[PDB]
């Protein structure tokens, strides 16, 4: 399984598919944002969507 990191102020998503890393922005509205720069994020490659630290 893949995995990326999430930023607190730069709420961004960075994951690597295979042997290369990518960069994507997280559309945080209310709680879709991040609170910890070290926190991890999730990105749907099949859904072509980016997700960050959200309440569940």
């Amino acid at each position: 399984k893949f995995g990326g990191e999430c930023s607190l102020k730069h709420n961004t998503c960075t994951y690597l598919k295979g042997g290369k890393n990518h960069v994507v922005n997280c559309g945080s509205a209310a709680n879709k944002k991040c609170k910890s720069d070290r926190h991890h994020c999730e990105y749907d490659e099949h859904h072509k969507r980016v997700d960050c630290q959200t309440p569940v």
Side-chain angles (χ1 to χ4, degrees):
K1 211 167 154 116
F2 78 97
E5 316 178 2
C6 188
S7 176
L8 169 38
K9 51 238 63 183
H10 297 270
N11 191 51
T12 32
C13 273
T14 301
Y15 67 105
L16 68 98
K17 182 69 258 264
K20 225 146 291 242
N21 269 71
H22 301 247
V23 178
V24 273
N25 210 103
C26 254
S28 57
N31 35 239
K32 285 307 308 208
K33 51 130 180 228
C34 260
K35 263 255 146 173
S36 154
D37 165 80
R38 306 304 194 178
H39 216 105
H40 77 137
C41 103
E42 303 178 352
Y43 168 90
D44 309 309
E45 278 261 60
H46 72 137
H47 229 317
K48 304 128 274 122
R49 313 215 323 278
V50 210
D51 319 87
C52 272
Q53 174 280 123
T54 150
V56 73

